[PDB]
Design a protein around this nucleic acid. Structure first.
Ligand SMILES: [Mg+2]
Ligand SMILES: [Mg+2]
Ligand SMILES: [Mg+2]
Ligand SMILES: [Mg+2]
Lengths: 136, 76, 76, 121, 82
RNA sequence: GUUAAGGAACUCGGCAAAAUGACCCCGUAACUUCGGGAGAAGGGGUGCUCUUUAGGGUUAACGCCCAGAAGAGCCGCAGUG
RNA sequence: ACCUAAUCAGAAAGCCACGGCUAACUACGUGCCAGCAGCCGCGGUAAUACGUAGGUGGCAAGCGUUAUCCGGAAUUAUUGG
RNA sequence: UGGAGAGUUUGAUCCUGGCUCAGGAUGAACGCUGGCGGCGUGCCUAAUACAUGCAAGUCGAGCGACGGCGGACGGGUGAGUAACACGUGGAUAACUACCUAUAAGACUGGGAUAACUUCGGGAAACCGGAGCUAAUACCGGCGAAAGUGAAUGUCACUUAUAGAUGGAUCCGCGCUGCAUUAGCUAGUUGGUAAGGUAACGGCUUACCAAGGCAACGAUGCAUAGCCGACCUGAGAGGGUGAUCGGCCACACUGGAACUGAGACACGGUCCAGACUCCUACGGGAGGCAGCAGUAGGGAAUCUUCCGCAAUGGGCGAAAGCCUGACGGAGCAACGCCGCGU
């Protein structure tokens, strides 16, 4: 507004918040690295084999994996692709991005470098799922 | 380890100045007692030796050379 | 005082110099005082000697120690 | 002369401080002990940042005392503080260091580690 | 000493011996909004024999340090009014 | 009246005893009806001799009583001994 | 570093997409299922919007995905409400 | 010189208005595939204990059979500090192993002792004793003074100069978030006193004196090395602090010193604390945020490489000598560039 008021208080701009909460900050030090920052990726360790549904009008079935992350906290997940060589308490790489119409799930289990290593059943969409073909 | 031999000078160079310094100051601490009596016998001809040890702020350079005038600036 | 110095620059497999002068307390790479001009080491598609003795005589008055391979510039 | 409910310092870095006494191990009806006997302590005070927490039944050995022992030559010894060392299930101390002069009596071939850690004995 | 900077300003209060405070005016420009704005640091000043009173316009020279903020040195009396 | 090591293990129950106690200082929480809490708690100092100076009243004044400060020094296990 | 002379075009190319945006389409299998999704969402009996071969488009010794930051956002706007 | 848009609330509109996508980035990770000439950058997460190697010496024209200059430059790191730490312009109350320009004078007179053989104790760190000796070592008269050697020349000593060089210091301005934090320090603010360091100084102490700061942000909390620059942008601005240069602080932790020209000293030092490990359990040793490599939390960052030829630095009058500064190589599509199949 008035140039008198703008001297007396500047434009304190709009804060934003992260779309994906449970990563990427200095958390809660407890004389060791009790919890840390994972900007793109991490390890995991699993806790539960997941089976769930979307909720809005949709009626399909989905297979998450409710884990405890490497910084004491609890998140859901998802395995893209077909195969599932995963059981309880097995290491899984992470990468962010929510899943719409599921009520509370958080990230994608990377199908390349983990115990989630390689998914067969795919032949054209490949590097999104970690499937090889050394002929070409 | 060629600073081993530098240590052997360091316990050896403490003796020469701290003898000179403690003789510099008690010749000067008795001097302002002798300058409190002023009979020209216990103050004369050793005050310039109290200034010779304040000239041995240039000879005994442990007391710094530019710091020669930190005490001797009043009596003479 | 000061010492006449060649700041080495230049990429991989190709040095190049700039004639500067500062005290030995200052390092090679930087905190350099003045520059009397460039110097050209390689001679293929490039000159071989470069100096400007106008502001070089300003430093041989208050003292200067040229390195004995830099003095072959100013002997020519 | 230790008793059935006296307190003792602990002279090591095992994560403890002043411990009580519960019972003196040995024969029945036993009422005192001295340098080099086991007891049953309980931790009444602890350093935050240790491996023994407060309120926990542990054993010990009496290492110093204000009473002392009498030796073969008739020599006596008297400390000025009571102290003990928390000992594990087999004979060896739980901590790492020991902050005091242990008694010269203490080993018989048996506590061959507590006398191997004291500043002097 | 002999040639130092000058901050002419009003004398606020003589409250102890050899000590006053000589306030000055400074309108400072803002960074981007353009409209100027006032800031008035109130610097203390040694004066020789309680020569100042409340309200004088003076002339100030600097010196070599004395104590906590007694860093300026009064010179003149341009105005001797109240 | 005193007591080695331990200190409520005594016992219906810390019952009786033991410790705390004066003046001068620093400092003091929750809570509240704003007065209180509060001597809250937890802390320090005190003896004798010698040198200087600032304090009332009495009185013309030497004289007399009332006092508080720093500094220097001495002795004992312990200075409201 | 450079450079000549040799049997040899012979060793030396991927990767994501292809409703609308947004650059690029067809035939079946499953067929509100294994899924997919940046939002509109395409899936109840194939479905140009899911895996598959064909086809094309993009970039190219590199192609996509993530988390983070600025522009898009005139959506903190003095220039600009 | 240069500045785009699309989608979605309704049966259908105009508007306000959010959320969402296309693009540029990464000292990124991870997903598939793999030809490189050539150029760069590769601890950003547990400040998690650091094997084995090399990084500070030099001088046999000191002098004997330690006396000098250098280890205050240089090369690593961001836990600290919201501050003259830094940036930017003003000021003098004073500080040089050096470097140099002229000139002075470089005299006189003495005596103590390491290495070395005996002496005894310790497993050791090594020490107490005794005969032996020079020194350019040591001593006296606003006052100290040096001599040395291949052809006297040369080269350091010493005093007063002033120039460069180098550090110190108060001052104007620039320096993050919060007011759901309003009071704040007491030697605090000031004179005076003598002491105190290169100098000014409440710089540390002593009697008097009643002030400092503040709604123009004083005080207290959590987050942070900072600039030149990097990123994006039409620009104005927003976000960042890495290699690369200038300045700053720190050395497993917390104090304090000593020698010298101007260290509170990374590789020295006495002490105190938590840790490793050996000894005869009487004692002593150890500090890779030097150059790499291993261990460790990790989704994540490399060779235990010969070597001083060039440029730069100590020492010497010179040959040269030590140089993990550096001149370069060993490894990853890590980034741009150029280039083929
Ligand atoms: Mg009470
Ligand atoms: Mg109460
Ligand atoms: Mg080094
Ligand atoms: Mg290097």
């Amino acid at each position: 507004p008035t140039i008198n008021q703008l001297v007396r208080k500047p434009r304190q701009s709009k804060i934003k918040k992260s779309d994906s909460p449970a990563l990427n900050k200095g958390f809660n030090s407890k004389k060791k690295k009790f919890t840390d920052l994972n900007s793109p990726q991490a390890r995991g360790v699993c806790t539960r084999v997941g089976t769930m549904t979307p909720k809005k009008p949709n009626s399909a079935l989905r297979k998450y994996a409710r884990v405890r992350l490497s910084n004491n906290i609890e998140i859901n997940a998802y395995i893209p692709g077909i195969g599932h060589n995963l059981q309880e308490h097995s290491v899984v790489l992470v990468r962010g991005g929510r899943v719409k119409d599921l009520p509370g799930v958080r990230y994608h289990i990377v199908r390349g470098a983990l115990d989630t290593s390689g998914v067969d059943g795919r032949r054209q969409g490949r590097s999104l799922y970690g499937t090889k073909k050394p002929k070409n | 380890k060629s600073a081993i031999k530098r240590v052997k000078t360091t316990e050896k160079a403490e003796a020469r100045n701290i003898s000179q310094k403690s003789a510099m100051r008690t010749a000067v601490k008795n001097a302002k007692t002798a300058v409190s009596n002023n009979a020209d016998n216990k103050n004369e001809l050793v005050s310039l030796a109290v200034k010779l040890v304040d000239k041995a702020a240039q000879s005994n350079l442990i007391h710094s050379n530019k710091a020669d005038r930190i005490k001797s600036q009043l009596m003479t | 005082a000061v010492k006449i110095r060649l700041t080495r620059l230049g990429s991989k497999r190709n040095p190049f110099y700039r004639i500067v002068v500062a005290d030995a307390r200052s390092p090679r790479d930087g905190r350099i005082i003045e520059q009397i001009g460039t110097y050209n080491p390689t001679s293929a598609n490039a000159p071989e000697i470069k100096v400007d003795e106008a502001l070089a005589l300003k430093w041989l008055n208050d003292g200067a120690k040229p390195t004995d391979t830099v003095h072959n510039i100013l002997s020519k | 002369m230790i008793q059935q409910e006296t307190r003792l310092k602990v002279a090591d870095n095992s994560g403890a401080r002043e411990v009580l006494t519960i019972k003196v191990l040995g024969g029945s009806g036993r009422k005192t002990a001295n340098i080099g006997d086991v007891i049953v302590c309980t931790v009444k005070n602890a350093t935050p940042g240790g491996v023994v927490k407060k309120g926990d039944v542990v054993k010990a050995v009496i290492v110093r005392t204000k009473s002392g022992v009498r030796r073969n030559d008739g020599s006596y010894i008297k400390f000025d503080e009571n102290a003990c060392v928390i000992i594990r299930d087999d004979k060896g101390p739980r901590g790492t260091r020991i902050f005091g002069p242990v008694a010269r009596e203490l080993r018989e071939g048996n506590f061959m580690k507590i006398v191997s850690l004291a500043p002097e004995v | 000493r002999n040639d130092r900077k000058v901050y002419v300003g009003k004398v606020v209060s003589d409250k102890m011996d050899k000590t006053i405070t000589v306030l000055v005016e400074t309108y400072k420009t803002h960074k981007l909004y353009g409209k100027r704005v006032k800031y008035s640091k109130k610097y203390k000043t040694h004066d020789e024999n309680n020569s100042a009173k409340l309200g004088d316009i003076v002339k100030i020279q600097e010196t070599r340090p004395l104590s906590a903020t007694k860093r300026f040195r009064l010179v003149e009396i341009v105005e001797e009014s109240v």
